[PDB]
Amino acid sequence: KAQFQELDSKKQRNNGSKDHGDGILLIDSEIARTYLLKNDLVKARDLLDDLEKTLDKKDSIPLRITNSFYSTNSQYFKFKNDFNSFYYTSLLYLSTLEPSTSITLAERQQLAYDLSISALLGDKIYNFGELLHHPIMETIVNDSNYDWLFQLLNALTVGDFDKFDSLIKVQISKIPILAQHESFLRQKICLMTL
Amino acid sequence: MSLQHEKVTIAPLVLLSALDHYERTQTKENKRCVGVILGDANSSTIRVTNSFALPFEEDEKNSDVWFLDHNYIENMNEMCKKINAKEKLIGWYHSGPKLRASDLKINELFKKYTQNNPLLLIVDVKQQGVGLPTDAYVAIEQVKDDGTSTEK
Amino acid sequence: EQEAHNKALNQFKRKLLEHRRYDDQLKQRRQNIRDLEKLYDKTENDIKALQSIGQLIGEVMKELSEEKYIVKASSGPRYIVGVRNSVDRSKLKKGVRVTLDITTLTIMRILPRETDPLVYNMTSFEQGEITFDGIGGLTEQIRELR
Amino acid sequence: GDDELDQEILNLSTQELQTRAKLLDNEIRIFRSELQRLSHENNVMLEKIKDNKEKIKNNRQLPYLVANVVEVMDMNEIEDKENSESTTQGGNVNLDNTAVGKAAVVKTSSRQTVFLPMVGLVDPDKLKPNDLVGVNKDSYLILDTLPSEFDSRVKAMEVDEKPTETYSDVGGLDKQIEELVEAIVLPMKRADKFKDMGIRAPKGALMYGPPGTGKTLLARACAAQTNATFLKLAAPQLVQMYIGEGAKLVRDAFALAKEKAPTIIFIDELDAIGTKRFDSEKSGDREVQRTMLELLNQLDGFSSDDRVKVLAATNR
Amino acid sequence: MVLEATVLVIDNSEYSRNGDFPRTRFEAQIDSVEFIFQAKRNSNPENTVGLISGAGANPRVLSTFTAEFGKILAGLHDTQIEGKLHMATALQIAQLTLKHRQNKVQHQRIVAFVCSPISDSRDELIRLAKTLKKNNVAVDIINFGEIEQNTELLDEFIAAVNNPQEETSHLLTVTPGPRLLYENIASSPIILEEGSS
Amino acid sequence: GCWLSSVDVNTQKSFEQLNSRAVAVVVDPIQSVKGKVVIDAFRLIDTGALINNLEPRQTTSNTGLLNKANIQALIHGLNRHYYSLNIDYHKTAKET
Numbered sequence A: 001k002a003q004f005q006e007l008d009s010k011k012q013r014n015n016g017s018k019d020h021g022d023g024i025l026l027i028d029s030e031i032a033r034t035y036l037l038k039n040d041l042v043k044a045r046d047l048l049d050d051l052e053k054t055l056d057k058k059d060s061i062p063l064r065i066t067n068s069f070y071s072t073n074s075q076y077f078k079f080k081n082d083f084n085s086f087y088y089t090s091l092l093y094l095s096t097l098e099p100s101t102s103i104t105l106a107e108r109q110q111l112a113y114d115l116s117i118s119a120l121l122g123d124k125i126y127n128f129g130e131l132l133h134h135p136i137m138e139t140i141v142n143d144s145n146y147d148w149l150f151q152l153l154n155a156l157t158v159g160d161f162d163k164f165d166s167l168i169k170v171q172i173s174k175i176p177i178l179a180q181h182e183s184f185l186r187q188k189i190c191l192m193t194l
Numbered sequence B: 001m002s003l004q005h006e007k008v009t010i011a012p013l014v015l016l017s018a019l020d021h022y023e024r025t026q027t028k029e030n031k032r033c034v035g036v037i038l039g040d041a042n043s044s045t046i047r048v049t050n051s052f053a054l055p056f057e058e059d060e061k062n063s064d065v066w067f068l069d070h071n072y073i074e075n076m077n078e079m080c081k082k083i084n085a086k087e088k089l090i091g092w093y094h095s096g097p098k099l100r101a102s103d104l105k106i107n108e109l110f111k112k113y114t115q116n117n118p119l120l121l122i123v124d125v126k127q128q129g130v131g132l133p134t135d136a137y138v139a140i141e142q143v144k145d146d147g148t149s150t151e152k
Numbered sequence C: 001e002q003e004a005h006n007k008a009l010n011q012f013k014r015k016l017l018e019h020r021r022y023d024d025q026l027k028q029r030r031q032n033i034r035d036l037e038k039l040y041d042k043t044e045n046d047i048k049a050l051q052s053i054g055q056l057i058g059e060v061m062k063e064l065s066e067e068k069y070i071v072k073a074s075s076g077p078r079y080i081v082g083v084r085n086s087v088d089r090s091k092l093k094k095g096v097r098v099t100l101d102i103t104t105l106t107i108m109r110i111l112p113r114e115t116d117p118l119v120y121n122m123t124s125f126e127q128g129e130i131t132f133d134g135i136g137g138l139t140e141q142i143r144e145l146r
Numbered sequence D: 001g002d003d004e005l006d007q008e009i010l011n012l013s014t015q016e017l018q019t020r021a022k023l024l025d026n027e028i029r030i031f032r033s034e035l036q037r038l039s040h041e042n043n044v045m046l047e048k049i050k051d052n053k054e055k056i057k058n059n060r061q062l063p064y065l066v067a068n069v070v071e072v073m074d075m076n077e078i079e080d081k082e083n084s085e086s087t088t089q090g091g092n093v094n095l096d097n098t099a100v101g102k103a104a105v106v107k108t109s110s111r112q113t114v115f116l117p118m119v120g121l122v123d124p125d126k127l128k129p130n131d132l133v134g135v136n137k138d139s140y141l142i143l144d145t146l147p148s149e150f151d152s153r154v155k156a157m158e159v160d161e162k163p164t165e166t167y168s169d170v171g172g173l174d175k176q177i178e179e180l181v182e183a184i185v186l187p188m189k190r191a192d193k194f195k196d197m198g199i200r201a202p203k204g205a206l207m208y209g210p211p212g213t214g215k216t217l218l219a220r221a222c223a224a225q226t227n228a229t230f231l232k233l234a235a236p237q238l239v240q241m242y243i244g245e246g247a248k249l250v251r252d253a254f255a256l257a258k259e260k261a262p263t264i265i266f267i268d269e270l271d272a273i274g275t276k277r278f279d280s281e282k283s284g285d286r287e288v289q290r291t292m293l294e295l296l297n298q299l300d301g302f303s304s305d306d307r308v309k310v311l312a313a314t315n316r
Numbered sequence E: 001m002v003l004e005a006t007v008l009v010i011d012n013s014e015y016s017r018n019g020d021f022p023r024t025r026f027e028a029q030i031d032s033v034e035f036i037f038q039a040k041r042n043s044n045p046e047n048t049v050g051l052i053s054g055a056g057a058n059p060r061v062l063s064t065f066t067a068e069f070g071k072i073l074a075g076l077h078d079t080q081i082e083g084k085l086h087m088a089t090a091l092q093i094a095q096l097t098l099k100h101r102q103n104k105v106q107h108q109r110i111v112a113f114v115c116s117p118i119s120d121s122r123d124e125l126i127r128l129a130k131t132l133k134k135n136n137v138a139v140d141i142i143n144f145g146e147i148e149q150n151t152e153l154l155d156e157f158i159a160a161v162n163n164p165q166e167e168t169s170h171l172l173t174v175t176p177g178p179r180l181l182y183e184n185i186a187s188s189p190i191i192l193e194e195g196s197s
Numbered sequence F: 001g002c003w004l005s006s007v008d009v010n011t012q013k014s015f016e017q018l019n020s021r022a023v024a025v026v027v028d029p030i031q032s033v034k035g036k037v038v039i040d041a042f043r044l045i046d047t048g049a050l051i052n053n054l055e056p057r058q059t060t061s062n063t064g065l066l067n068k069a070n071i072q073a074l075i076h077g078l079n080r081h082y083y084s085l086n087i088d089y090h091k092t093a094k095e096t
């Protein structure tokens, strides 16, 4: 960051075709991610809020800038376990995806897992059909982890109880996350169907 | 730029001027007179006070080809600041008859001269709708409904 | 002195002095634009101000409707004026200073009331303290006021 | 400044400094193009300034209206995200566009009080209360500045100490000649002491009694001693023409006086711009009393008012 | 030489942030404009040089015809850089730019700087050739970025255009590595070539 | 109201020279309330026209009617320094 701040002052007029202020924003985003992993969630969030301000006042910023900022904001809600907040901000990452290398093969499969889990446990989501139709969750349904995970997501979309309740038994034993939300998930299917 | 824009009122001087310009450049058969729209903006009510023709070409074979004069805009803006104090470039008009997707590309370049978001103000020169011919638009950016591709 | 290594050196002096000079000259060319730039704004704003046109001050004699007011102007005459949707009608109340066009006789905008200097000076600053035992022989009369 | 130091010669030999010379040229050509970039942006801008100044010229030249500034209002600039005025209008943030920043209240000579959007070339900085200003005749905007009003009678009033009556040609008159020195002459000359001590200076004086006691005499003389700028005013002289022009004259007089101090401002026979009754009709001669009052106030405004002494006389 | 209008197609790309000409190519292409613009004036002072960009998402007009070198550079400072050449598209806008002029006596020529290979097609470029020689526009390709690591099939279009014209069409090779881009186009024929009937 | 002052006759005179026939349309927009009233066209009368009675050749080969918006104001300059003839409005159907 200190090298990019020196560089930029001469080079904006020197090249006379290029910009170099773009780069500073992205470094703040990476700095915010490192703090989240480290588990200093508050340090990142107040860095992220100041960064937010700057971005809204610009309209000429690259499609790369928005992609780093939303990814970082999603990881914050996943540490906190705000299911609703995660769902919507991960949808915003998907939109801002670039054909350019700024993703891996790992990251697709792992966003797909975390999305599905958040969705089930949201308090206001009904974007189950919106997920189904989306590429991300479409491609991986043939692996053991994402097999049930698809069929749970599918049984909610369609209001169907015969497939839904049969799945819920398995996941109490299998996954302890979903062994204390058992009560929640049964109220949720009924709520949508109504 | 601008985040205050709800409605655009149009005086009938502007609607007639655009109409005249189409027929005094000899541009017809779904070719385009494009001009700048002048008047106050950066308000919820945008009011367009005046308009004048800009030199403009289009080739419908490839719409990634068009001619817009860079000299002409500057010179007209200088003159127009004298007559009324209302007048400044707040967009560009299109002569219709429809909203082509070719209209994004023009709007992209047009942002540089403007002190706001430019407006894309369609004025139809042949009359349409039980409602008005005149329909106004602003360039904004948003996420689609497939949850993929942020398109302006 | 007399060698050709000195003749080579002097030429390199020109090459480095011009390098640096051309830099001191970039900084100068920039200042010439900024100097003109201010001067430009003042002459320009002048022309736009003429086109805006003066106004005449008055005050509400009597609120008659919620978009229409009756006024008395400081030119002498009483008018019945309309009110523009720019300006607030809450900030319009009976007796408040207003300023209204000489083109359409319409109250354009609020004119906050002109403070009267004398009473205003004393509102603004605190006139205090004086001590109770700093006053002698009127000491009873301070207490009686309390 | 100093090129090819001792240090560069040891470091790099002459042959190397040839390769150095070539690299420098290439970068000097880059910078050289920017000068053509910058020259141009400057050239177009000059043309713009002169194109404006030509439009101004016609409005700006004489003839135009004369007015007075009552007060500079100093209305708000910016509290909204659009315009510069409190009310929300179509325009955008500028000194003038549809936006109005500062404004000032003037009292025209066309008998109107105008609150006007302020111009680009006249600022509130360039004003003060009670300044005479050119206002364009056809639309009322402050157009250009003017110095403060000066009048032929006002100019005359300052200096008239000669004829001098002294106290060697005024037979007796004591206690009163001594009393006059104590009030006036003695603090005027030892003025530095009076600041240091912290006592007040007498806040003028009133000399009164039946006529022919020789008041006029003693005030003229008082001024000779102290060698001071003597202004004489008399209550029918002070009022001239329209009675709303009577108020400018008092102010004008006192503007002169306080400058070039010491001074004595002596106002004779006050019996019609200092009446006790408010029944006898006056509307313009009332403003004359009020602008008399400012002067006394600024004596009280110095604490020690050694510099500016005032005397007053009346028959009853 | 005399009475000539020339639409400069200057590309700004991801091959031009390379520094084979000092201090990148953007900086050397600024210096190319100055020499070109002066030279034209030296032959005939009524010469105009225009400018468009094959760069970005949409090729666009950067500057119009003008008798000032200042205005042309003023427009070039803010260019895209993320794009690549689009060669077919460049030619159709440049043809349009050469229509709008003070006088029409001026020669029609296009000179295009290549820093990047075509993003278009051979199918398109075949068509462009038949189109151009009807209107006597020359194609004159300064290549220096489609020979660095590439090959060009643009030789074919030069010859297909060249006939007796207002300005003849010829190919101007400039090494891709250091040779100082600005002096090589200035030294090579750009007014030393002229037309015939 | 619509009338002409001396200063505007001097301005008028040079448009007359530039283009043989030319008009002056004078808009007083604060005695206008129908968008059409207190708007008249005017045109110079020559000094030859008054003395040799070649002034009213404009009352012939036209409607020969003059419609006043200001009776007092037009009549004053009608002999002095102008002849007024009435104004008409037009549009094509696209415009309407």
Ligand SMILES: Nc1ncnc2c1ncn2[C@@H]1O[C@H](COP(=O)(O)OP(=O)(O)OP(=O)(O)O)[C@@H](O)[C@H]1O
Pocket: D169, D170, D171, D172, D173, D210, D211, D212, D213, D214, D215, D216, D217, D268, D269, D313, D314, D315
């Ligand atoms: N005490 C005096 N000693 C010398 N001469 C005197 C004296 N009193 C009056 N006089 C003479 O009488 C003349 C007229 O009196 P003077 O004009 O001074 O009256 P005043 O008291 O100042 O008047 P007003 O009340 O009208 O202002 C003086 O010019 C002087 O010649």
Ligand SMILES: [Mg+2]
Pocket: D215, D216, D268, D313
């Ligand atoms: Mg006396």
